[PDB]
């Protein structure tokens, strides 16, 4: 209804004022000597955590405007965590830095649209200047090493990851489950994974990772949109029986049907999750089939008079376990006949022998890959259930950091990678003085992460920063042992992919806000 | 109940005060160097946009009076966007201009009714002075060029549009859908399109374009008014089955029936949309038939004892897809027999051989056109679903700008077209000094758009405006490259139809408000 | 409950203060260069109108007393519009005038009861002095001319009306409907019209004219009062079927039954309207029959053991269309046998051959008139549905002004008719000085309308008024062209009946208020 509108300067300080709350609350956790943040929880005992991610999830101010501000950097900052499995707190302290001096420059009368381009340039450069500093990581001798460092130095984990990547390839699919006791197990099973996320949160039941998870569920494969539950009743209540959770894969689920389901998931009356079929066009229709074959059961496409009513229980698909993320569905262990699946790949290969194109070929040998590669399944084992649930956590995290180094390499941690990249671009300039400031602002900002880690350690930020800017390469400052040297050798590093992300993202929102002139929101 | 009434001057500042909030919030996006407006959204992360249309949709002030003011220019300013597919922000910043100086003049004691006529004259002239500046656009060499410029320079889009217009004519019917993969597809199908809009929003499900859309729906053709759902139950619940959405085309739908349906569309219990039959009189009755033939199925007219109860499922019409706008219904791909339809056109032509009139002839060869022309259907293709949904967006927009140039030509963009037309009418005068002011106010106002684009770019509005007023023709100022020259050659243009619209509309509301003496509204 | 009571002077300023809000808001439209009044509307875009009638409908103040004042002049001022189809804004600006100086005189210590009689005299005279200035209008050459002028000069309209009046007589019945395309149609159908209004608003569904309207409805003719719906159920739900709306004509409808129906009309569960049978006594009983014969079907009178239960569907009446006003029911096209009706008129004429009286004769040849005259039905035609709905509006209005001139002639418009009549009574006096003031107040007031029209045009009211008072006859001032001359010849006129009405009515309420000493209302 009635709205409140703020303009230019007025509207900007509100945002900043807002983001500061966010940034300051989250950054006291930066690296080693990070402090605790006490998050009060409805009923019970508070939660004491040093996890920047958890602290941010809760932050949400009262002033409608200040909130937007804080809410804005959160939207993006999380985008970095979803891409490299880390670097949210980082991206945030960065955006605070850019934004602060930036808006400062605007008040200084300079042009916004220029400060922006000047920033985007200083970044575009820092990213290439970062790919160069990036130390490769391809031999399984390194994988096993990164995975290790990314788990408080448990040489077991590192090894486990490696043995896995070795079975399915660096591009393979690796899954982590609970162990059946002491001793770890690993092996590949007929499975698959496509780039589709849950059609709505809530379905989530493991907020620890923010994902869905179903045991020996049913998979409904229907080529068509679904917005009316009235087509589900026959083959949905028949799933309340057997208690076997249900996964619906259709071209899409809308309104009535979707909402109706998002409801029942909290009301326990059947736990089902559904996601969009993969891809689009005729390929989507074909991939839907692949899934069906792989999981046994069939597709229900209108194209052939099939209706969601004339569908019994065997028409349905079934696998031993599925896992949905914000943007990834992965089916583990398919009932599909290890003989029928081998026959489907037969077709797909005799369809490449008729590849009257190049694009058409890749997309096809891309399908055999998924359908023939299978999925690696690591089962963490430990002495006690506790130790084990804990270890399974570390492995799940190491498995993430590892894949981010295998893709883009790793660089010096503790925030030095950025501070180095910054000192290397002092000569950089742009089209006009404003743009130059734009550059200088972004560069100045890249020191924030380090200067904060140091600060959290009751150090002298300036001394330590200048010192690190003095050396070259990955000469950093292990803030954990107050001793300078090579960061990679000391075991303090970050997947280049996360540092690059944190920076690109921070810079994105920073830019947008510096270029905002008007905010519209609801009246309190 | 009790109302609040303001008069003359008092009531006017309120309106102005209101429209200012609207105008200022929306104009900060004028020109490529436009800023962002952060629109807070109920629950979630804010929305950062530079789209003036979206910013206006949200604006709505608290003061009952100021609101009306803002609400008034929005009603009209959107009328411009609905006519040429663009130019809302423009029409708004224009109305602010006219209104500001106008009410200023009224306070100055001058007469309102005269300022008005003086304004309408200054416009009436600007419009003809604009048709002259208008560079034609008829050869498919130009269509393919305008369509291109109206899509960040994707020479593909421009070509696609052209190839289409070539198949159905400049007056043809062009539809855009999702592609079935990489590579674009184009072809004509038995379809039709009449000038009837949805009988109520809400039905809308693609607020991205503000239109309805149904897949392989059913079409109900009934010649009669419908206000009681009790006549639908038999043949409406029979449509809940098959899940196939339903389109009702009847002389009109009122109250009980209509409301009852507008309800169910949000409650997911069946997604149906209905619109008024085309035309009126006996012709409406005949056109209804055309539709029926074209979509297979029959009409239910009381004239022959038929009731909406004795109607099975085959009596109903059916097509592969429909699309309703604020004022346009378009049926795509009709089940109708490509042989029966050819027989209907038979009659309509042997009915022209009995055309004892002229009017009667045009209206008939106007029907064969719709029923025999068919509909062109472009299917945008791309590498990934994302790229594709994006491209389909660009094509949909380029397909709009194109038709607005094919109708009335194109003129220099960046607001110069107006500023030129203005400098050309400095000699213009009216019946008295007031009317002269009226002229001078409108002229002065026509510089707003340009002066703002410039201002958004941190320029010196005056210098740049005078320079542009110095040259002649389409000598403008590409604000994107700070370099003057010919606007059309630089690729900066606007369909004459949108510039004309924005102006005529802005002037309309400006006029009304300047001539308002009393406002009546509810008490808070 | 608890009430608030004001007395004499105190209570009067409150009313005046109130009526001033009404008058000032509405008069800013009165004639030509009239201004706009923006009426805010709940949800949506405001309404900009110059229609005094619409502006008044909304006005309603907060102060309980001031409201009464404004609410009082509205009650009457509308009485004038219902009598001559125009002259509400006029009657209002008139009442303001009388009341202002009147109450001014009261404070001046003069007597109220005398100011009144002095005013009523000044009016009684102006009315006769007005019948004399009235230019006749009887030859269809004039009808066709007045109808024309009363429609922005569309010589088609004027002609249409005339061709109609020619078929049914000046006292005939003329109906206006939508056309079946281009070209107008006119013809008489077996119909009738009596002086009974709707038994309650709400039934209304065409607030554009403030009337009811039913298509091919059913007519229930029952001689008896009806307050219990329990007698309707059998023959009312049987009408929910067929969907055919129902018109109930009974001696009267009260409470339970009535309310119950007024409810359902908004709840769409059946759209029925009912009105009182015409006349009273035995004649009412007989006229009820006439209707029945004319519309086929029969009357249900208790006098012969008939009950509203033992009534099927054929016992009911039926016509092709009905239209109810605030005080007029008119049945159009009756199913009645064009042969049976001719037989009823047979009786009624052989009943005049036994007319042992004079009164008895007239009332009878007054019935054949209605039952044998039929109804003229004009079907406006146009190029497009829009143009047509618009034209049908103009015809509907012209058809009103025409009948008001045919009855009492026409006089000079633009408010001169009154100002002339006023300058002709300067010599008039009464029984005492107070009454004389009473006179002088009314005369002074009769200049308001003109002085305002002039004022709205940014003129000098005094100069223009004195000039017009100088001349004689219909020498007026066409405020549209600032040129004096003969008003009738210039085409600026008003049916004498409306000017007479506006005046008599304004004077009525003005009188009442000047003579009020106490106001009682509810406590806020």
Shortest CB distance from C40 goes to which of B111, B283, B519?
A: B519
In chain B, whose CA is at the least distance from the CA of A77? B45
Was C31 annotated as part of a binding site? yes
Cβ-Cβ contacts under 8 Å for A359 (sequence gap 6 or more)? B182
In chain C, whose CA is at the least distance from the CA of B519? C38
B86 and B157 share one domain? no
Angle between helices A112-131 and A416-423 (to 10 degrees): 110
> Residue B273's closest CA among B334, B321, B208, B224?
B321
C22 and C46 share one domain? yes
**Rounded-to-integer distance, Cα B162 and Cα B149, Å:** 13
Q: Do B179 and A283 touch (CB under 8 A)?
A: no
SS3 B390: helix
Chain C residues contacting B via beta carbons under 8 Å:
21, 24-25, 28, 33, 35-40, 42, 44-46, 48, 55, 58-62, 67, 178-182, 215, 240, 243, 267-269, 271, 385, 388, 457-458
At which of B348, B371, B394 does a domain end?
B371
Q: In chain A, which residues are last before a break of more than 2.5 Å from C to the next N? A: none
Encoded tokens for A314: 């065997």
CATH number for the domain harbouring residue A421: 1.10.560.10
In chain A, whose CA is at the least distance from the CA of B264? A256
Closest approach of chain B CAs to the CA of C58, in angstroms? 8
**Rounded-to-integer distance, Cα A468 and Cα C33, Å:** 80
Answer yes or no: are the C-beta atoms of C414 and C453 closer than 8 Å.
yes
How many C-beta neighbours within 10 Å does residue A460 have? 11
Q: Domains in chain B: how many in total?
A: 3
SS3 C495: strand
Using the Cα atoms of residue B511, residue B517, residue B523 and residue C1 in order, give the sign of their dihedral: negative
CB pairs < 8 Å spanning A and B: 108
Encoded tokens for B221: 């053709």
How many C-beta neighbours within 10 Å does residue A81 have? 23
The secondary structure of B243-254, three-state, reads: CCCEEEEEEEEC
In chain A, whose CA is at the least distance from the CA of B64? A2
* CA dist A276 → A226, B205, B397, B460 (Å): 11, 19, 27, 52
B31 and B102 share one domain? yes
CATH number for the domain harbouring residue A367: 3.50.7.10
CB pairs < 8 Å spanning B and C: 105
CA C520 to chain centre: 30
**Rounded-to-integer distance, Cα B319 and Cα C75, Å:** 56
Q: Do B38 and A280 touch (CB under 8 A)?
A: no
* CA dist B474 → B86, B321, B418 (Å): 20, 43, 10
C514 and C423 share one domain? yes
In chain B, whose CA is at the least distance from the CA of A109? B458
> Residue A403's closest CA among A167, A208, A150, A195?
A150
**Rounded-to-integer distance, Cα A481 and Cα A461, Å:** 15
| Method for this entry | X-ray
* CA dist B119 → B444, B515, C480 (Å): 11, 12, 19
Which of B517, B522, B523, B524 to mutate to test binding with chain C, by most C CBs within 10 Å of its CB?
Answer: B517
A365 and A402 share one domain? no
> Residue B274's closest CA among B335, B202, B209, B334?
B202
> Residue B192's closest CA among B281, B293, B283?
B293
The secondary structure of B408-427, three-state, reads: HCEEECCCHHHHHHHHCCCC
Shortest CB distance from C25 goes to which of B65, B279, B518?
A: B518
Encoded tokens for A80: 């970095």
At which of C354, C382, C409 does a domain end?
C409
Was A329 annotated as part of a binding site? no
A476 bridge partner residues:
A485
* CA dist A66 → A15, A39, A70, A72, C501 (Å): 5, 20, 6, 10, 64
Answer yes or no: are the C-beta atoms of A423 and A441 closer than 8 Å.
no
Angle between helices C88-107 and C433-445 (to 10 degrees): 150
SS3 B406: helix
**H runs (alpha helix) in C27-111:** 52-58, 64-84, 88-107
> Residue B512's closest CA among B69, B4, B186?
B69
Which phi and psi (to 5°) does residue C284 adopt? Answer: -55, -45
Which phi and psi (to 5°) does residue A503 adopt? Answer: -65, -55
**H runs (alpha helix) in A186-225:** none
Q: Do B521 and C39 touch (CB under 8 A)?
A: yes
Encoded tokens for C170: 């000046």
In chain C, whose CA is at the least distance from the CA of B518? C37
Query: Which chain A positions have a beta carbon within 8 Å of B181's beta carbon?
Result: 280-283
Q: For strand B375-380 and strand B246-253, is the pairing parallel, antiparallel, or unpaired?
A: unpaired
A206 and A349 share one domain? yes
A386 and A464 share one domain? no
For the annotated binding site of B for ATP, the residues are 29-32, 50, 86-90, 414, 478-480, 494
The rounded radius of gyration (Å) of the Cα atoms in chain B is 26
In chain C, whose CA is at the least distance from the CA of B302? C242
Encoded tokens for C452: 């305002």
B205 and B323 share one domain? yes
Answer yes or no: are the C-beta atoms of A130 and A417 closer than 8 Å.
yes
Element containing residue A5 per DSSP (H, E): strand A3-7
> Residue C166's closest CA among C491, C406, C396, C379?
C406
The chains found to touch A (3+ Cβ pairs under 8 angstroms) are B
SS3 C486: strand
B123 and B149 share one domain? no
Query: How far apart, in Å, do the first and last CA atoms of chain A sit?
Result: 11
**Rounded-to-integer distance, Cα A58 and Cα A74, Å:** 11
B364 and B501 share one domain? no
Closest approach of chain B CAs to the CA of C51, in angstroms? 12
Q: Which DSSP letter does residue A88 get?
A: H
CATH number for the domain harbouring residue A163: 3.30.260.10
> Residue B84 belongs to what domain range?
1-134+410-524
HSE at residue C383, side-chain half, CA atoms within 13 A, is 3
At which of B409, B425, B457 does a domain end?
B409
Closest approach of chain B CAs to the CA of C38, in angstroms? 4
Answer yes or no: are the C-beta atoms of A492 and A474 closer than 8 Å.
no
Q: Where are the beta strands (DSSP E) in C128-283?
A: 174-178, 185-189, 192-194, 214-215, 218-226, 246-253, 272-276
Q: Do B35 and A517 touch (CB under 8 A)?
A: yes
**Rounded-to-integer distance, Cα C272 and Cα C177, Å:** 21
Q: Do B38 and A520 touch (CB under 8 A)?
A: yes
Burial of C339 (0-12, 13-18, 19+ CB in 10 A): exposed
Q: Do C36 and B515 touch (CB under 8 A)?
A: yes
Cβ-Cβ contacts under 8 Å for A238 (sequence gap 6 or more)? A313
HSE at residue A86, side-chain half, CA atoms within 13 A, is 22
HSE at residue B141, side-chain half, CA atoms within 13 A, is 2
Chain B residues contacting A via beta carbons under 8 Å:
21, 24-25, 28, 33, 35-40, 42, 45-46, 48, 55, 58-62, 67, 178-182, 215, 240, 243, 267-271, 385, 388, 457-458
Shortest CB distance from B35 goes to which of A72, A256, A515?
A: A515
Cβ-Cβ contacts under 8 Å for B382 (sequence gap 6 or more)? B179, B182, B388, B390, B391
How many C-beta neighbours within 10 Å does residue C472 have? 10
Encoded tokens for A166: 């070795």
Closest approach of chain B CAs to the CA of A353, in angstroms? 20
Which residue's structure tokens are 């804990």? A390
**Rounded-to-integer distance, Cα A51 and Cα B238, Å:** 56
**Rounded-to-integer distance, Cα A61 and Cα A56, Å:** 11
A324 bridge partner residues:
A329
Cβ-Cβ contacts under 8 Å for C522 (sequence gap 6 or more)? C1, C2, C3, C4, C64
HSE at residue C103, side-chain half, CA atoms within 13 A, is 24
The chains found to touch C (3+ Cβ pairs under 8 angstroms) are B
Instruction: Provide the residue count of chain C.
Output: 524
Cβ-Cβ contacts under 8 Å for C346 (sequence gap 6 or more)? none
Closest approach of chain C CAs to the CA of B341, in angstroms? 26
> Would you list the DSSP string of A320-354?
EEEEE-SS-EEEEEE-S-TTHHHHHHHHHHHTTTT
Element containing residue A130 per DSSP (H, E): helix A112-131
Encoded tokens for B69: 């003011």
Element containing residue C6 per DSSP (H, E): strand C3-7
C347 and C199 share one domain? yes
The secondary structure of A346-396, three-state, reads: HHHHHCCCCCCCCHHHHHHHCHHHHHHHCEEEEEECCCCHHHHHHHHHHHH
C114 and C162 share one domain? no
SS3 B275: strand
The angstrom resolution of this structure is 3.3
Shortest CB distance from B268 goes to which of A15, A228, A281?
A: A228
**Rounded-to-integer distance, Cα C418 and Cα C93, Å:** 13
Chain B residues contacting C via beta carbons under 8 Å:
1-3, 5, 7, 11, 15, 64-65, 67-68, 71-72, 74-75, 111-114, 225, 227-228, 230-231, 255-257, 259, 279-283, 359, 512, 515-523
């Amino acid at each position: 209804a009635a709205k409140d509108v703020k303009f230019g300067n007025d509207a900007r300080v509100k945002m900043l004022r807002g983001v500061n709350v966010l940034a300051d609350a989250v950054k006291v956790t930066l690296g080693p000597k990070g402090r605790n943040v006490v998050l009060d929880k409805s009923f019970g005992a508070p939660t004491i955590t040093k996890d920047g991610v958890s602290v941010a999830r809760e932050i949400e101010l009262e002033d409608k405007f200040e909130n937007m501000g804080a809410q804005m950097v959160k939207e993006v900052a999380s985008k970095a965590n979803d891409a490299a499995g880390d670097g949210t707190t980082t991206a945030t302290v960065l955006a605070q830095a850019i934004i602060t001096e930036g808006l400062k420059a605007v008040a200084a009368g300079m042009n916004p649209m220029d400060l922006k381009r000047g920033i985007d340039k200083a970044v575009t450069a820092a990213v290439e200047e970062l790919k160069a500093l990036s130390v490769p990581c391809s031999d399984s001798k390194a994988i096993a090493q990164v995975g290790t460092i990314s788990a408080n130095s448990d040489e077991t984990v590192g090894k486990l990851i490696a043995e896995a990547m070795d079975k399915v390839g660096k591009e393979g699919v690796i899954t982590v489950e609970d162990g059946t006791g002491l001793q770890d197990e690993l092996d590949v099973v007929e499975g698959m994974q496509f780039d589709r996320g849950y059609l709505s949160p809530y379905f989530i039941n493991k907020p620890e990772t923010g994902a869905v998870e179903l045991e020996s569920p049913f998979i409904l494969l229907a080529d068509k949109k679904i917005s009316n539950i009235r087509e589900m009743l026959p083959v949905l209540e028949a799933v309340a029986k057997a208690g076997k959770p249900l996964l619906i894969i259709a071209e899409d689920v809308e309104g009535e049907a979707l909402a109706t389901l998002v409801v029942n998931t909290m009301r326990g009356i059947v736990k089902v999750a559904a996601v969009k079929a993969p891809g689009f066009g005729d390929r989507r229709k074909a991939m839907l089939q692949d899934i069906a074959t792989l999981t046994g059961g069939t597709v229900i496409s209108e194209e052939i008079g099939m209706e969601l009513e004339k569908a019994t229980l065997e028409d349905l698909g079934q696998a031993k376990r599925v896992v949905i993320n914000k943007d990834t569905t992965t089916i583990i262990d398919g009932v599909g006949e290890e003989a029928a699946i081998q026959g489907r790949v037969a077709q797909i290969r005799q369809q490449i022998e008729e590849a009257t194109s190049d694009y058409d070929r890749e997309k096809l040998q891309e399908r055999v890959a998924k359908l023939a590669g299978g999925v690696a399944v690591i089962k963490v084992g430990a002495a006690t259930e506790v130790e084990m649930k804990e270890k399974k956590a570390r492995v799940e995290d190491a498995l993430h950091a590892t894949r981010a180094a295998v893709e883009e390499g790793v660089v010096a941690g503790g925030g030095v990678a950025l501070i180095r990249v910054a000192s290397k671009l002092a000569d950089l300039r742009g089209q006009n003085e404003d743009q130059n400031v734009g550059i200088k602002v972004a560069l100045r900002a890249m020191e924030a992460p380090l200067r904060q880690i140091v600060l959290n350690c009751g150090e002298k930020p300036s001394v330590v920063a200048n010192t690190v800017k003095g050396g070259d390469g990955n000469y950093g400052y292990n803030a954990a042992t107050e001793e300078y040297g090579n960061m990679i050798d000391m075991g303090i590093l970050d997947p280049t992919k996360v540092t690059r992300s944190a920076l690109q993202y921070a810079a994105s929102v920073a830019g947008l806000m510096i270029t905002t002139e008007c905010m519209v929101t609801d009246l309190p």
